[PDB]
Amino acid sequence: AISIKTPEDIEKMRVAGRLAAEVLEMIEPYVKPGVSTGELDRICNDYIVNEQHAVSACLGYHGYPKSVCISINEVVCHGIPDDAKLLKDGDIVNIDVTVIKDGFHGDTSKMFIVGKPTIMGERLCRITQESLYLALRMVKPGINLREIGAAIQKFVEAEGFSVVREYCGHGIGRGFHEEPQVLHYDSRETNVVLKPGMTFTIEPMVNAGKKEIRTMKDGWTVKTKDRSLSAQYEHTIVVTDNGCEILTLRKDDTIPAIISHDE
Numbered sequence: 001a002i003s004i005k006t007p008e009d010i011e012k013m014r015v016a017g018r019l020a021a022e023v024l025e026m027i028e029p030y031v032k033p034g035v036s037t038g039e040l041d042r043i044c045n046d047y048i049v050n051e052q053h054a055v056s057a058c059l060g061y062h063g064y065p066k067s068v069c070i071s072i073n074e075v076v077c078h079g080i081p082d083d084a085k086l087l088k089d090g091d092i093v094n095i096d097v098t099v100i101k102d103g104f105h106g107d108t109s110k111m112f113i114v115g116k117p118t119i120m121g122e123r124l125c126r127i128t129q130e131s132l133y134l135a136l137r138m139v140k141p142g143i144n145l146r147e148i149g150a151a152i153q154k155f156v157e158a159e160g161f162s163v164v165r166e167y168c169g170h171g172i173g174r175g176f177h178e179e180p181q182v183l184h185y186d187s188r189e190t191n192v193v194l195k196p197g198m199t200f201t202i203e204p205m206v207n208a209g210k211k212e213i214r215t216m217k218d219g220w221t222v223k224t225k226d227r228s229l230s231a232q233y234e235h236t237i238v239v240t241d242n243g244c245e246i247l248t249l250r251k252d253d254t255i256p257a258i259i260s261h262d263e
């Protein structure tokens with residue numbers, strides 16, 4: 001069921017979480033107009049293997065052929081790095097990373113805007129990160145995941161955007177995806193009360209248009225049914241006695257690593 005990580009295991013999660021976050025901080029300077037997504041993946045894998053001495057949890061997972069997922073514009077998730085796909089000005093791109101180190105997983109992703117940004121692109125990404133942040137500020141013992149899911153949905157929909165229902169956040173530890181499921185919308189099936197020690201991810205997928213998605217015939221690429229833009233941000237966190245601790249925080253994040261709700 002819902003596992004409570006021991007202090008030792010939480011420390012291992014901090015290490016793994018930091019590594020995942022550092023892959024994103026490392027790749028930043030390379031996300032430029034003209035670069036291929038295949039190249040970005042090789043850079044990430046070489047870094048993960050040769051420098052972090054860790055391993056990508058995506059490589060081989062259900063047969064996935066690459067180390068990280070790179071999704072551009074209308075692609076919602078699981079975009080496959082390809083040497084023929086070049087980034088260009090105005091593109092919004094999500095790079096999703098999951099590394100395993102000392103037996104524990106670190107899971108995180110962020111949006112990158114390539115070259116000259118488009119206003120709609122920046123807005124979609126900003127609102128998506130904001131939906132993740134508001135959810136993070138709600139995490140603390142006693143709160144129900146349903147409340148967080150409902151809050152994310154209300155915020156996103158008020159902005160004229162939609163939340164993807166097919167995918168969700170998840171518990172994480174020695175396993176990539178563990179209990180509980182963390183839906184980013186209201187559901188009567190959700191009734192999970194948070195406890196200190198729980199580690200899970202929050203990773204809303206937000207579409208500028210309709211919520212419906214579609215899977216391409218390559219068996220991996222998921223796109224919006226209406227071809228509207230889609231954005232996602234993800235962080236791995238641990239519930240503490242008075243709130244939570246973000247384990248995959250980056251220099252560019254603008255929310256505190258440790259959130260407290262006590263007086």
Ligand SMILES: COc1ccccc1-c1ccc(C(=O)O)o1
Pocket residue numbers: 058061062064069078096107203234
């Ligand atoms: C290889 O990527 C996947 C394939 C099947 C099911 C889930 C995934 C996946 C990619 C990223 C994540 C996640 O962040 O949870 O999960």
Ligand SMILES: [Mn+2]
Pocket residue numbers: 096097098107108109234
């Ligand atoms: Mn991920």
Ligand SMILES: [Mn+2]
Pocket residue numbers: 107169170201203234
């Ligand atoms: Mn995840």
Ligand code: NA
Pocket residue numbers: 071072073074075076077092094229230231
């Ligand atoms: Na996208």
